[PDB]
Amino acid sequence: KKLMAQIFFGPTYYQRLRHMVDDKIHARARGPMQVLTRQPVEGRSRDGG
Amino acid sequence: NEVFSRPEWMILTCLPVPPPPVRPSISFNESQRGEDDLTFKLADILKANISLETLE
DNA sequence: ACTTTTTCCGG
């Protein structure tokens, strides 16, 4: 069924950006700790808190 | 305060040596030290304290 | 004469 509205439809040059979810996503639930502070390590890479 | 903070105690006579948990030896691999800055600085104190002691 | 803060999160 036809839309009651008419859509602004045409090509538009879109760019893909360097930020992609699966490179951003992170979870931790007990992991590596600092030596000094004995606290969770920093950064997704390092499986940080 | 006579019990916890007499003025004479602001002048250091006997320096407390903090234990390793405070100045960890970041011992990368087997045969390689990696001692903390506080360890180096305490060494410099000792080094200077010995020269003075012998000197006098 | 003289000091100290300023939003939150790969190398």
Place this chain on the structure above:
RNA sequence: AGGA
């Protein structure tokens, strides 16, 4: 060096 970079995101919100």
Place this chain on the structure above:
DNA sequence: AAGT
């Protein structure tokens, strides 16, 4: 950008 302020204030001992």
